[PDB]
Amino acid sequence: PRVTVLVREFEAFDNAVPELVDSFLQQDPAQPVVVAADTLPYPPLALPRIPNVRLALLQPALDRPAAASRPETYVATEFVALVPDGARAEAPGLLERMVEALRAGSARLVAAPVATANPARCLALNVSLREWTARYGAAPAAPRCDALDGDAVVLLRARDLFNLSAPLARPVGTSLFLQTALRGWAVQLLDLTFAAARQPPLATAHARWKAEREGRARRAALLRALGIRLVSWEGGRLEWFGCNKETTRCFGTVVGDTPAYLYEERWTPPCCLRALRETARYVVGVLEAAGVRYWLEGGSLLGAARHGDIIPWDYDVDLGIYLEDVGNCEQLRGAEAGSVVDERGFVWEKAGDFFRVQYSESNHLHVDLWPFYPRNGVMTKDTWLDHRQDVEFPEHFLQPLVPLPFAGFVAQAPNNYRRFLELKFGPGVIENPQYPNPALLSL
Amino acid sequence: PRVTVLVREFEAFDNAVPELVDSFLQQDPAQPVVVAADTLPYPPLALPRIPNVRLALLQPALDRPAAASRPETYVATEFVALVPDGARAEAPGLLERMVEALRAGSARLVAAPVATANPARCLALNVSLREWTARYGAAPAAPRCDALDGDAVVLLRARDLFNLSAPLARPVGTSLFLQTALRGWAVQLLDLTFAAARQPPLATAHARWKAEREGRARRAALLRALGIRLVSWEGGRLEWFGCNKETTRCFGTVVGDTPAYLYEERWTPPCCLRALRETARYVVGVLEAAGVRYWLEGGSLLGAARHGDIIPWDYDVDLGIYLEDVGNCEQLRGAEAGSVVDERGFVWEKAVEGDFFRVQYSESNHLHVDLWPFYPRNGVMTKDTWLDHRQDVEFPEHFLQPLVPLPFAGFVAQAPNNYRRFLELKFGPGVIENPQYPNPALLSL
Amino acid sequence: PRVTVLVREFEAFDNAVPELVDSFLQQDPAQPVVVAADTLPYPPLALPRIPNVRLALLQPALDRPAAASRPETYVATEFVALVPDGARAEAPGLLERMVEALRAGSARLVAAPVATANPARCLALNVSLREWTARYGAAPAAPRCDALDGDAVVLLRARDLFNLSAPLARPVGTSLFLQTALRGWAVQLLDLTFAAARQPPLATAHARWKAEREGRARRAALLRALGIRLVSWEGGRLEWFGCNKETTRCFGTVVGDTPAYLYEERWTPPCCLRALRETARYVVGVLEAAGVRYWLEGGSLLGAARHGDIIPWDYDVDLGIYLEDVGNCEQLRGAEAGSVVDERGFVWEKAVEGDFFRVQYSESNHLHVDLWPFYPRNGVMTKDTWDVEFPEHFLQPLVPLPFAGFVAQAPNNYRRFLELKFGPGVIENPQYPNPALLSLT
């Protein structure tokens, strides 16, 4: 029946951790309390220097053993209560009751809101490591929940908390439930509530604005570190944490037609797909504006026919165009002389006998334009690459072209495009997805 | 179930604590371990400087809070396990079996012996603070004991251990069980054995001798601090820790006729009583051989009439003698010229206070027999000096004609005939039947 | 098998780790080999899929248990051999030759150079965390070293390696010996040599540039993360890793006149002292040219009298000046009308609160010299704010005294000067930082 209060979410420049710890100490002078930090907080916390109150510094240090940063080693009790800064212990026995709430219930974490300006509300949460995405929403089975948002004391067993890979990664409210929801654990939000501190931290607009900013920075670094590129919400809100126009793309050059993320049993990072989708939309826009006749090719046509979007592990977009229209588009005229950075940042190059448009000078997510010319009613070209799907095809497949949803817009595809896709890939290609190179890595 | 190992019994100059602690760490790397020492052990213990292994220094220090020397602040777990030096954890999960045994059973402590040359064995023990006595014997209902002798891992709840007044006084083997047995607590000796250290401490004959010496000195200091004058064992073995012939008596000058121990709700220390009996016996023998007519007086006669022994809170022995007999006894003759130390170290002297003699056990220990000389006037025994006590009166000489034998303090003493009537005349009716402290207005039974 | 080969220093884009692994299995099929990486290396390594070869990915992951990112999990042997990329096992049975060497000797680490272009050289190393410095030099007791430079297989007991805080932090060649030297452990460089890979990694100038760019960035992040602000070779060729003119000072704002580094049981960062010496010399150079009578004051005069430098745990320089002299310095006159950033980046300010001047290293780095103006009153040096008054004869004359790399002026009889303001014996009894007492207050 012994519970270690463990404090991790606080700002060194402005906290109420002294009040927090003293408030628990008034209910039990021998109360085990562990304040955790990456480095020594300054200005000093000035905690009581008694054996049951310890400061656990989790960063590596040349004069400290491995144990010194492993937090479970500061915790001897069966249960641990994560307490946010701004909380206060007043009524005695509140942790005893969360403990017997836990043993009675079936959720492996119980939680009690702190009566702050943002008391913990309950959230649904699915984590897709394969798609680098976490999706929150309202919780159907509240007070049974996957995740919380807001301030709460969270009690669970030390064996449960400290077997996680990142038990106290900040922000705790995000990092913890990402790991427990993935494991299928539930948090049950009890009806107990902890009081707020009497002199709460971040009392001024300047202080809380500095806290929020540093807090947004920790959260971004956390999600980047743990393979979450995108956080989405019921209602449509999106939080992006990956590549954009000014960065590089999220993965290096692709060997064996098998991108790095597949070997990590992951698919294309959602920010990379999104850059491809806007490059695709942009390139189609200037192609159509130039009167260049284009059509979805390769995996782009496949993904469009299969589910109207980029195949979730693909990393480029492929369009075929008529060779004799190439001249009508300015960017492409220039691309034959050299690389072309147009007024919107996209990079047009010729390299191969095809053209490539890159999202930006730094982000090399590309659209490939393959020019074909007709010879005896057969679309062909003069340079080949060793792939099953790089072949000639009858021109009647382009007479006419048909509207086909793709990557958020309506594209042009060959008529009878399922027959077209069967021609280049083999029978059943639409219904039988497979990785770009099953020889090395197969879905 | 989380259990803190707590090491309190070891010697800084030769121990196996590093191996003890490391052997528990090889079963659980985050095992909470608390080494408790009065002062920082030198040479260094060199325990792993890791957060789950702490060293509790229970000394006062100018730069530490009160909590620093209170061992409960170093234990966060619900159960704690006292582990003696020389024990090593072999079998994984030995303490988990101890915790569930304790919750299944009804004893507040459970114990596992360690496979040393002296594994813990079951003992009975009652403690009598009023008589400063601890009485050990064989355990009637083993494996449920009041106390153990020898090396054991003892597991209990921290709340129970650290509500004791001296949880880790040394030797813990003695200290712990006097406190738990006085509280009616049982220790269940389990059929679980911890292994001994592969390199046991005290390997040399010189170190064990040095180790036993500190232990015996620590043990004697413990019982003196706790009011245990006498430790008795079935089979009759007696260990004493009070006064003796060559020290001072246990208590100081008695004021108000009420000795210090009575206010502490204890009776006369067993060592003082024993000195008084052997002084009473010896003086009676001197007086008989010298031809001095004596009889038991005051509290000595009263105690004799009640149960043939000194009243359990009394501090002296009183005898009456015939004044015309003092010249018969060599020690009494010298006493009037000055204080005399005789053939056996007893000190005979005439008292400052009116006209009586006093025989002290030794020069240093002033437990004493008082010799009150009386002389007859008209068949009335009297003296020229009188203390201001109610039992200090004249009495008819016929009470002394003749004397009757009466057991007292292990020998047969001489007493007034009709000593009931004698005692009631001096103390008031019913004195024999109604024991009472020497001054009820200050401290009553 | 008593040794687990553990390879940590390699690059995903160009390596010879497959050759490395293969070479050791060709000598023993059962050889335990762990390739450690922060994330899954790409292009794939395609090492043998056997139980004794395991890839340890040490970064925390949402789907993995805590044990998965701890290197001791992947090692079940008594000894670990740290093998750098580019090494290769050619002769058989040299890892246990390295074991029999470790057993017999007194060093906790043994090492054998790899026959690369950069084979391991024996190095001396002392780590002072209180001075945030790593001092390297040639090894006086070679082949017994405190550190290596270059390619070597290093073998030590797995219990020793994985008990350190940062056992596999990169670069290993730097992180390992910063940890083991600090513990006073030694490394014995054997007369044994590992062959190089027959297809050595980073064979091109471009690959080597990419590797060194990344390796230098790792090294700088490691030194910062472990509080090594200065690295030196034989007292020279200094490499800095702390603050400078374009950053903030290392310790931020000071509360209770106790800077952060004291609570971390250290002295002033050496990059901060270097800035303080530079500002003291710059300000003294500016006062001497403007014709401003100054003298060292407080802890700078005490430092100068004791060892002729800034006291190694102090964080500012203090100078006394004549108040009537301030009008002769452009910055001082401008500082009284507001904050001044002069031609060389120092900011001269007139603290409204204390009635004194302050010259900071730069707009961002607030290490500062304090200027305290006195004016003569009836023979005594005084001011209107409050550190004591003192007779003027201490300044008639003023005396050359070495301090912080240059000759500054101090009160005459400065030992008596110091004794009056600080107490007798002050020069001989430094208040050494007291971490124990600082905890109590």
Add this chain to the structure above:
Amino acid sequence: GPRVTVLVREFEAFDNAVPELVDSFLQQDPAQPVVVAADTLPYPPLALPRIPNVRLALLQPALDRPAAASRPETYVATEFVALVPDGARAEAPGLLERMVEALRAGSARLVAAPVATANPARCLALNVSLREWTARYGAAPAAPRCDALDGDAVVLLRARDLFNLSAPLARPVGTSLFLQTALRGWAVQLLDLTFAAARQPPLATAHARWKAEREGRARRAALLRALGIRLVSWEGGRLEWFGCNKETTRCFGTVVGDTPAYLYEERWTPPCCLRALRETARYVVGVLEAAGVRYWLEGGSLLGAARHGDIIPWDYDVDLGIYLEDVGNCEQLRGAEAGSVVDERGFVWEKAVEGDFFRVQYSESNHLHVDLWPFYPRNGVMTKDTWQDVEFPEHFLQPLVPLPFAGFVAQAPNNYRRFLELKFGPGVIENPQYPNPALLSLT
């Protein structure tokens, strides 16, 4: 409701005015909480009023009492405690709370009022140094603000402050309290209020006083030994010692490794041990100079002389180098190879086990020592045959230079700075290793 608990700790059981003290405070508030603390039950009996707010707190372990019984805070329900010394009396109602209003309205954590005895409390300065095992008393420069008191004072502080010290009621309280509070930087403000003396004051005869002063001094000397105070000084002088000397053992035992016990307790060398080493160094030097042995400071002694002219504060021996061709001129030295030599002044001179050096110990029992290292000049370089210890050129000794050290003048090698850096490394004088307790804990 009363907010102050009177606490009485300094009295003698054989002679006291505690019954009068207690009656005086109850005479002004019959519900006033009063606690009398003692190690054992005071005899002769105190016979205090058998009332619930008067309690005897017996502070020693007892076989039949709970832990709380020997803890003084158990006996105090108020925010404030007034330590009252025997001999004091409450004649003027209301002073207890004027001390409380004064404490609240001021900035010192303790306030005090003198008792109008023959020894009324005087204001003192006190800096404690655990590293140097010294308490340094002096006149209080900022009176009425003190670090310590001398004499009889009712001292009032918060219960929470007093009972969180390690030895709140250790005797004599006038020593133990202020050693602990001055160490923390706390201040005691001696108010301008006065308590009356007992109408029948305790210890009114010389014999009674003599008994009380002998017990007090014994408690004080035990208190300083237990607490690691080896030297009390008044205005830098009037030294009072509580450590080792010529007839005791030396404070630390046999040293293991190169680390004496005092280092692991985060202290430096005991001042008694430094004092005996200065006495021995001077004695040894005086003997060698009289006998005509060429000596010079060596090792850490030369380093201490160069740096600040004394033994380095955490060093435990003195080293001197001597010319071997000169040993025959010292009687104690020639006898030293025959065997151990106690000289006329108690110093023990012995030849090395096998190390080939001479050791002069302060006494047979106190093994603080000066080591004499003989060298000879092979080709102008100083050598010994078995072994900071290094060869060094002989010209450093031609000639020898005077150098102040340990309260006298000793001979040093010429250019001792260059010498020291050959021996220890560059800049050894200016950057002193003071012991790192953490690193030594790490090892």
